[PDB]
Every structure is written in structure tokens, then in C-alpha cells.
Write a protein that binds this ligand. Structure first.
Ligand code: NI
Length: 341
């Protein structure tokens, strides 16, 4: 049964609730972004409206095969009416096409659902600046002071230099980058751009990236593995046996792989900086774990909510245990007392 934190009161709307059947009294189904936990349940056989970004729209049509008429895309930053409710979609700074949703209820209540987001100061100068928000439905994935991690530009720098070094020392070396969803494209794009290559990948992953309205994207990727020296692979495969395997496949064209695992948080963030990272090494293969997050750090979260000063916060992540819920209420209370809202 759809949980209360996927429902929008005084509307027929649900958010990221595709996996319970027909939720009785749901006229519309909003989807924040294309990652499987949020879209779970969708197929070609859905015949209720869906609301979403143009990009998330392109992915539903071409990857899951949802019928044209049921995908309602919306422009961002645009006051839009949807069953006589003003809504606005805002960039969530998560994976491509990912949105936060502003709901303007008839009664005068204003509600922000963040989906999955990485909060940024840029968001304080958007349409949220104009007016008050009474309820915040919040991605609490890293709501605990232990969770720090570096910025996206710090991480990308590291990655660029590392690869550009190795390939300049040994030109017969191969870069590989792991991936299992959309998101974190910048890793493999920024590397490939410093190396003067296109990114090689499967057919499936090319079809996926072709949906994302990236500029000059035809010039940046290929389905030809032979003619490229930055390859993508399923994250499952990014290990010693599975790389060696793949290193056999390329046919005596490279002698050394230098791979990247873009992780989120890991426990070594508590005891090591970005400039001081090292790889595991079984011969000619070197694997780098790098903490590139598309979710908010504890502090980024904190600042956003302290600026927004919402009247009520409702967690959408790590809600499934009482200890996690209870912990999170402490931090919401600390934030509000500190800031005087
Ligand atoms: Ni997500």
C-alpha cells in the first residue's frame, strides 16, 4: 500500500509511486527522475497520465516503451496547470532530467518535493526565493554529520589529471569507467575530452545516452569499441577477473587498464582526502574508487533547509527503521533551533 510520504494531500497526485497498482484516488503520477527505485512498475501497459521532464519523458518512450499520449513532459522554471493545480518543476542537480516539484494547493498550502537531489546554493536564486513553503518532502539519504564528501569539480579534476597522466606515460593504456544507471556522465565525458577520444559503450548504453539532450552528443560517444580509448562497463564487471577478461577482448591493442569506480560515500571518506587517493593493483590493472555524489552532503542539506525555513519536513529516504527516523528528527530540530524559524 502506497506510503503517506508518496501522497500529496488535497490533490489526486502521487510522487514516485509506480509499484503498488492503481492507488485509489490518484488522477496523476509524477516521476522525479529515471532511476529504477522511483520508476519501478512502469511498462508499456500503463494508461494513466505521467508527469515528468522532457528528458525523463524521452527515457520512458524509448527505454520502457510507454505510449506517447500518457507521457506529459513539462518545461522547467515554468508556471504550469495540471488538473487545476499550479505546479513548477525545478532542476534537482541529481541525474539527467531529474526534478523537484513545487505544488500550489487550492487552500493556499505550498509544498516542495525534492525527489533525489544534491542541494546547491544556486537553488536559492530560483523560483523558491519568491515565496513561503509550508511542507518539504526531503531526500534524507545523507542526513548524518559523518557524511561529508568533496565537490563534483574537485572530483572531476582528480579524475582528469589521473587518466591524462597515465595515458601520456603509456599510450597503450585503456581507461574504463563503471556505470549502472543514468547519472555521473561528467566522469567519463570529462576524461574522454582530455584524452581526445569518444566514449565507447554497448548499444543499450548508447541508446540511453541518446535520450538525454546533451549538446554535441553525436561527436562525444560511439558504439565502436575499437576506435575509442575510454570504455564504459557495467559496474558489476569492474574488478580484476572481469577487467582481465575485457582486456583479452580488445585484442592486443592495450597493455594496461586504468579504471574508475564512481562510488557515493564510503567509510574511507572519514579518514582520507581527494588529493590522497590510491588504487588497488593486481598487475597491469588499477582500480580507483572516487566519491562522486549526486545526493546532498550533510552540510549542503542543512544550509538548504536553514534557508528554506520550512514549517514541516517529511523524510522520503531511510524511513524504514525507527532508529533512523528518530535520529533524523533530532537533526531537523537542531537546525530549526539554531536558525530561529
Ligand atoms: Ni536517484
Amino acid at each position: 500500500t502506497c506510503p503517506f510520504y508518496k501522497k500529496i494531500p488535497g490533490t489526486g497526485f502521487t510522487v514516485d509511486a509506480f509499484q503498488y497498482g492503481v492507488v485509489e484516488g490518484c488522477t496523476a503520477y509524477f516521476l522525479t527522475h529515471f532511476h529504477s527505485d522511483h520508476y519501478a512498475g512502469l511498462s508499456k501497459h500503463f494508461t494513466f497520465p505521467v508527469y515528468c521532464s522532457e528528458i525523463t519523458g524521452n527515457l520512458l518512450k524509448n527505454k520502457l516503451h510507454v505510449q506517447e499520449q500518457y507521457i506529459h513532459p513539462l518545461p522547467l522554471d515554468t508556471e504550469c496547470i495540471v488538473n487545476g493545480v499550479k505546479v513548477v518543476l525545478l532542476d534537482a542537480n541529481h541525474c539527467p532530467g531529474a526534478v523537484m516539484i513545487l505544488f500550489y494547493l487550492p487552500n493556499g498550502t505550498v509544498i516542495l518535493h525534492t525527489g533525489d537531489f544534491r542541494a546547491d546554493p544556486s537553488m536559492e536564486r530560483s523560483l523558491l526565493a519568491d515565496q513561503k513553503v509550508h511542507m518539504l518532502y526531503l531526500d534524507t539519504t545523507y542526513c548524518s554529520p559523518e557524511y561529508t564528501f568533496p565537490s563534483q569539480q574537485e572530483v572531476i579534476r582528480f579524475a582528469i589529471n589521473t587518466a591524462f597522466e597515465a595515458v601520456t606515460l603509456n599510450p597503450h593504456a585503456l581507461v574504463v569507467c563503471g556505470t549502472y544507471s543514468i547519472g555521473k556522465e561528467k566522469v567519463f565525458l570529462a576524461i574522454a575530452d582530455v584524452l581526445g577520444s569518444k566514449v565507447g559503450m554497448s548499444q543499450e548504453k548508447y541508446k540511453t545516452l541518446q535520450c538525454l539532450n546533451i549538446p554535441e552528443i553525436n561527436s562525444l560517444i560511439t558504439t565502436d569499441m575499437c576506435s575509442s580509448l575510454v570504455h564504459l562497463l557495467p559496474m558489476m564487471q569492474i574488478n580484476f577477473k572481469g577487467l582481465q577478461s575485457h582486456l583479452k577482448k580488445c585484442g592486443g591493442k592495450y597493455n594496461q587498464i586504468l579504471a574508475f569506480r564512481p562510488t557515493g560515500w564510503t567509510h574511507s571518506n572519514k579518514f582520507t582526502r581527494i588529493a590522497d587517493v590510491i588504487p588497488q593493483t593486481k598487475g597491469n590493472i588499477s582500480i580507483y574508487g572516487i566519491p562522486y555524489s549526486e545526493h546532498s552532503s550533510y552540510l549542503e542539506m542543512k544550509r538548504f533547509v536553514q534557508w528554506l525555513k520550512p514549517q514541516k519536513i517529511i523524510p522520503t529516504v531511510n524511513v524504514g527503521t525507527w532508529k533512523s527516523r528518530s535520529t533524523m528528527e533530532k537533526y531537523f530540530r537542531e537546525w530549526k533551533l539554531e536558525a530561529g524559524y
